[PDB]
């Protein structure tokens, strides 16, 4: 037991709980990587090294606009430039190269076998990743003020606080590796920040999961349910008043109406 960890072999799961997969287990320099259903396959095993590289099949994950354009690929650590194979993982689920600051690891589609790319970082739910060996959605209740539970109301189209009822289906949420919070009874449906407003703040509702930057959330150590990246906002119970039936997206202040607990 030691506070320096040298290398670690784990998995990376992203959009729609799918995994980062080196396409058809290919070993060649320039073999491209795709989103694919998670399994124990060697090409879904990713090893992180203290040098900052992230590797499968003994080769390094890499991005270079001159050589590969927009596409993310595995390539030899000896051959490639040290700039192009170094990586950073953030608590909010962003995987990115420190040299290519505007860009972030992306899956432009939710479907399997889709080539992974380095797009412009909008902190979108298609740019959200969980590094870790447990890839499954984490299912629980989400508890706010007055020990009340978030409930999916109006045929899974709105969201607000109700008195907790154990094993009520509409009070169960599934937290996915992409940072989406999804209706347990319908996994095509995401907690989303709407265009509709209350007191000039976006109201939170349930819409179809579309991989936007309105449907990516991170549970932080401060007890907030927040948007990733800068210009951060938090989920909050409007006016600390459960009777308003309105959850809105507010500037973070860490008060009770912005505090939540995952009851798993």
């Amino acid at each position: 037991n030691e506070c320096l960890v040298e290398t670690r072999t784990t998995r990376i799961s992203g959009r729609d709980a799918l995994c980062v997969d080196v396409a058809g287990a290919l070993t060649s320099d320039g073999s491209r990587l795709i989103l694919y259903p998670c399994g124990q396959q060697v090409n879904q095993k990713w090893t992180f090294h203290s040098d900052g590289t992230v590797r499968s099949l003994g080769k390094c994950l890499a991005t270079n606009n001159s050589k590969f354009g927009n596409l993310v690929v595995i390539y030899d650590c000896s051959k490639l430039a040290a700039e192009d194979i170094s990586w950073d993982v953030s608590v909010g689920g962003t995987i990115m190269n420190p040299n290519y600051e505007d860009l972030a690891l992306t899956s432009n589609k939710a479907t399997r076998s889709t080539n992974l790319t380095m797009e412009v970082n909008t902190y979108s739910a298609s740019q959200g990743w969980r590094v870790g060996n447990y890839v499954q959605p984490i299912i629980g209740s989400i508890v706010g003020l007055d020990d009340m539970c978030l409930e999916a109301t109006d045929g899974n189209t709105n969201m607000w606080l109700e008195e907790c009822v154990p094993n009520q289906r509409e009070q169960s949420w599934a937290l996915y590796s992409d940072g989406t919070i999804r209706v347990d009874d319908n996994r095509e449906l995401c907690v989303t920040a709407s265009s509709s407003t209350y007191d000039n703040w976006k109201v939170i509702t349930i819409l179809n999961c579309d991989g936007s930057n309105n449907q990516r959330w991170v549970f932080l150590a401060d007890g907030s349910i927040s948007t990733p990246g800068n210009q951060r906002l938090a989920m909050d119970v409007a006016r600390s008043d459960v009777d308003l039936k309105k959850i809105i997206l507010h500037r973070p202040h860490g008060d009770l109406n912005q505090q939540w607990v995952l009851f798993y």
Binding site: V91, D147, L220, A221, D222
Partner: protein
């Protein structure tokens, strides 16, 4: 840091636990947002 059970609901319990965390957790030393226990009081 007191807890009275006659004057006790969910809200006062949470406030009490909140104060224990305040007093035992470092004001400046945090990792990923999570406080490390204080070296002294």
């Amino acid at each position: 840091a007191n807890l009275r059970l006659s004057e006790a609901n969910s809200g006062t319990y949470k406030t009490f636990i909140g104060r224990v965390r305040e007093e035992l957790g470092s004001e400046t030393y945090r990792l990923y947002g999570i406080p490390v226990l204080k070296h002294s009081l």
